[model samples]
Target chain A: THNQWNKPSKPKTNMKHMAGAAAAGAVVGGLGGYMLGSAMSRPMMHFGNDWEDRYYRENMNRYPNQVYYRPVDQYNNQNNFVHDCVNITIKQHTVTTTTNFTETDIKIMERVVEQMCTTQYQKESQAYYD
Target chain B: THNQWNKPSKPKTNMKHMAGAAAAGAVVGGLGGYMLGSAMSRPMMHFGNDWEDRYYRENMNRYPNQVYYRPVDQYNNQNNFVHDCVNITIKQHTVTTTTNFTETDIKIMERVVEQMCTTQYQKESQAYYD
Candidate 1:
């Protein structure tokens, strides 16, 4: 009687192969879905913790006069459930020792301000449940 | 016959007094309307031309490093037809020779940035027809 059941066990081996294919398919589908969702949503760039502190530390040698910021307008998007999106208008400025700021200097200053906003948005959204 | 028309000239003289009162009422009404209109609209503070120049000239002795600005966001309101109202976020920073930025020092820096925006708005609105 056991041998009769074992004779049909070839299909059971085939079932294991089908299960493996299903697991692989799920993984691929999940990854593709995640990528597609991310692409469709608004891009939110993030720079890590204490970005300003690190920036000052790295740039202090070059800029004798430290940089400062003024935020003109900062508000959160009311409708987002997953995370509250932040909209901000901020300025980053520093006193210059030199007469004229070169094009490279302006670009560097812009990067500092842009990175500051990205880091701020990331930190603000991190605790959106509150 | 001339006096019949001339007898009505006294009423014409009374008409002059009525005209005087009417002119006075118009002047008063015009001023009140202007004041009321100003109060109702968004407050736009203006600082005259070369405000930054004057500020730097006065404060340069204190701040050896000249302050510079980074404007993160500057845009005009699309709906405002009479004058395109500009909204701006600007930051001013300096490299201080001293250790700490005093409350007074911070206040002065804030004033600088505020005045800059006001002057920019005024200048921008002046050429609205263009």
Candidate 2:
């Protein structure tokens, strides 16, 4: 009957080596994953934090006291005609000079663009139907 | 002469335990970082990958043969008047109906918007000066 003394030593071998390797792998993989994740998150951070304030400040400095157009509504008008409407905002840029234009004038200017958009829509619709 | 063989054995203890804990921490931190990173990335993904294709398709389906406005040029006209001009593109959107309008008609519609935009600029200028 051979009682193998070496069999007792086997208990200390596999888990120890395997555990060390796993630890190494986890450290390396974690560092790699964290780095890659940070890289991916970089551009998105532009929009995520302080982005609107930056965008407004930058553009306002460039185009002070100007009107910028933004799309506000798109709907099918009567007879499925598409009406693409925009809402206009005046960018004042916090200047010492106050608004020179009256409310009536502002309304007129806004109406001009609004009516123009509808006119274009009508022309396109006419072209399609005619 | 007191030689501590047990003191030599201390080398095996700290690193082994610390290494295990560190490995666990790294794995947990990495997974957490990865998940958080992915969560932050979700909204940005809308504009990052395949976004334009999806946007165009969706809008086209909703509003076929529509003219959408985009800002192209922003400059101060003569006398420091801001002239914000835009270039118009017709969103034909893969329609089988084909363009019912000829090149001349397309040109006319484009000019209508362009002229109207200029008109608005003039009106705003007049309001400011008056």
Per-chain TM-score, chain A, candidate 1: 0.14
| Candidate 1 clashes between residue pairs 3 or more apart in a chain or in different chains | A65-B95
lDDT of 2 by residue, B7-85 (tens): 1111221224211222333333331123221212211211111111111111212212233333232322211112222
- Candidate 2 stretches with Cα past 4 Å from truth are A1-93, A98-102, A105-130, B1-13, B16-130
| Shift in Å, residue B17, candidate 2 | 3.5
Candidate 2 local lDDT, A31-74, one digit each (tens): 11222222122122221111111111112122123333443323
Top lDDT prediction, candidate number: 2
Alpha carbon lDDT of each predicted model: 0.20, 0.23
Question: Taking the tens digit of each residue's C-alpha lDDT, what string does model 1 give over A1-130?
Answer: 1111111111211212210111121111110011110111111221111111111111213324443333332232111111112343555556545332213111111223222211111121111110
For residues B1-130, write the lDDT of model 1, one tens digit per residue: 1111111111211112210111111111110011110111112222111112111121213323433444233332111011222344455455745322223111111222222111111121111111
Candidate 2 clashing pairs? none
What DockQ do the predictions score, one after another?
A: 0.02, 0.04
Q: Each model: TM-score of chain B?
A: 0.15, 0.13
